[PDB]
Symmetry: D3
Subunit: 152 residues, 6 copies
């Protein structure tokens, strides 16, 4: 299992697609422990047409979504390694989200870095927590519990 993955790999693991695949690259990955990934934020994203006009702010809820996707990748690969065939049969679902705090607004030009760590894991149930960072500063923090379920 490698520690760096690019968009082509992320595409083979996550079921998410435009306009909901919110992770561009993974820089650090340690099975059952943590992951560090990021998503570039550009004005050239449909979301900014409505959030907000003349005032582009990346939706906080999407920051959270990005962290979860990161956690989901971590969870899956921790269990099956880089296995596209199986990834294609599994799907990660949000069970809970807690202690979410937005400290700094994210805007075009920003590199939204996700820092998630495994707080608890047993089988398909994974609890992760971490922060979203921009230039080393915590722009947000959150905790979530995910479920690795069947796609059917």
């Amino acid at each position: 299992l490698q520690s760096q993955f690019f968009i082509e790999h992320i595409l083979q693991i996550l079921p998410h697609r435009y306009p909901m695949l919110l992770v561009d690259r993974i820089t650090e990955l340690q099975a059952n422990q943590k992951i560090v990934a990021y998503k570039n934020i550009t004005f050239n994203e449909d979301v900014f047409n409505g959030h907000f006009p003349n005032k582009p702010i990346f939706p906080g809820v999407l920051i959270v979504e990005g962290m979860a996707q990161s956690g989901g990748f971590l969870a899956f690969t921790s269990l099956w390694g880089f296995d596209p065939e199986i990834a294609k049969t599994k799907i990660v679902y949000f069970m809970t989200i807690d202690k979410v705090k937005f400290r700094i607004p994210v805007t075009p030009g920003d590199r939204l870095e996700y820092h998630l760590e495994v707080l608890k894991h047993k089988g398909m149930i994974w609890q992760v927590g971490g922060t979203a960072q921009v230039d080393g500063k915590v722009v947000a923090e959150a905790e979530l519990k995910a479920m690795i379920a069947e796609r059917e």
Copy 2:
């Protein structure tokens, strides 16, 4: 205390594709609000969440609850005032106790039920659930702060 999309457009700064509230069916100042957003396949989000399996994003359910709550907080203090609405912004500070129980899909009428847990000055804490056909599909607590635009 019915508001339709046109009224909503004059209060919330959110526009497509991030205005997630279609109508407000109930509103009690400083107490509660009930609103909803219809879920149809004809939404761009479904192209990627997920292909061959449309599921309205859980985070977007929370966003819709937030928008409803912000609408509740705003109108409670200033009522239906478009002019003042442009000079104020309601952004969220925290979100907690979020739980997803049932997946929302095209055909569902996503109803938001938020009540004021407490408020002090420009800091308001709302909480409640998201419902479809009378069942709780999600629940969450959010804290917002009303500030001057600019």
Copy 3:
């Protein structure tokens, strides 16, 4: 009932031209009742019209045609995704359509279509579109199922 997943297996239409979200009633060679939710979160509203969201009358008719199309597919071969994935549908005629009430975000656009006449791949249906029990539009149309 047939949900979006089932509708996707029969109708060839896709985003942003799949305008039926669910099938509530189906009676082979007789009628069909289905609907589509109308939400502000639809790209059409950016241009119809700015500052005044009104669901296009022609799209209401399209939604009725699709509903009729689903009735035609199933009446012809039942719920068969395999043969369905090879056909498409062409509009042939549209007649006697009247719009009485504008459809907007928050509305539940319900399609009520019955078979007027049909032969082979050519189906002619007619009915109304309703929002909360009231008729918002009436129409008759004939479409043809074809091998793509």
Copy 4:
């Protein structure tokens, strides 16, 4: 009143906008009588993503919409002439549609020419009828009645 109008002029008269402004140019226009205009059809249009996958067919209902918009432009300029200030607060409602027949499918690379004639008009209520053509051939026939109304 001119007889040739370009997209810029159309934008100043019709309230429609992307993705529902289906008229690119007006080639000839006779007040209270007829109008000839057209819309280019290209693969680079969002509708084609779903109508249909691997087989781009310009939706029949949108052809009708295009003719209605052509009629709408004719209706407005016949009423107030070319006046953008009056135009910016008017919208247009479809009232009825009749005797439409589609003969030939329209596809990317086609120049959809609208030919509408005024059958009857009274105040804001205009009833036009005509055809849509491609390379001199009739691909559609349609009769419609639309109402111009002040936004309120």
Copy 5:
């Protein structure tokens, strides 16, 4: 053949919405020249931002269309209309030169691409020509691409 419609173009070029900028091919002569075109309608997303109240088809996209026309010519020159083989190839465009824009392109225009092979050595194809609207040269450019095995 000499005339390919959108159906055929789709089976040869990997490009898809919103980057497939060639609607039909009216002329094709293996190893020599290609004449094709793309209609320009207001109903295109690019016009939402280029520019508000002033729809001007982007000059770089005219070049892209020409490039796509060159790529179809090159490919068809090597294997003809072969969808199966098309799936295993890619045409990397290495350079662009001598491009000049003479007349803006707008909704309602039939952008016609006129390209010819200027040189072909190995996997390298140098193409050049013009973009026309109603008989008038609207733009011109030279492009060089490399044929390679897709991956």
Copy 6:
């Protein structure tokens, strides 16, 4: 005239809007001499739906467009400084493009950096040339001449 401009400033100067505003932030600016800016590349961009499926690659022509917009931002501010009022009355026209080379493909997660210098400028006509860089490496080269014109 400062040297760092964020998206809010770019929005008030350049007439480009979604989905054609391909410059997110200005990092260095020397009036009439040079500019360094960038655009973040994310998978969450509509253009990637078609360029190409299962293989996101930021279009070479769009990189040139990005360099042109950076040039346009330099040209305008050199001429009128930060003046939103006057910026509203202009648009930018591409006149020529030359010597462009595409050395390295640009993909999601990349920070596309634009480096442009003024080769010549006379009135509204500006000739700029430079490179596009990702992590200090030259990804593309180009020379172009644009013109700032009245919206009329």
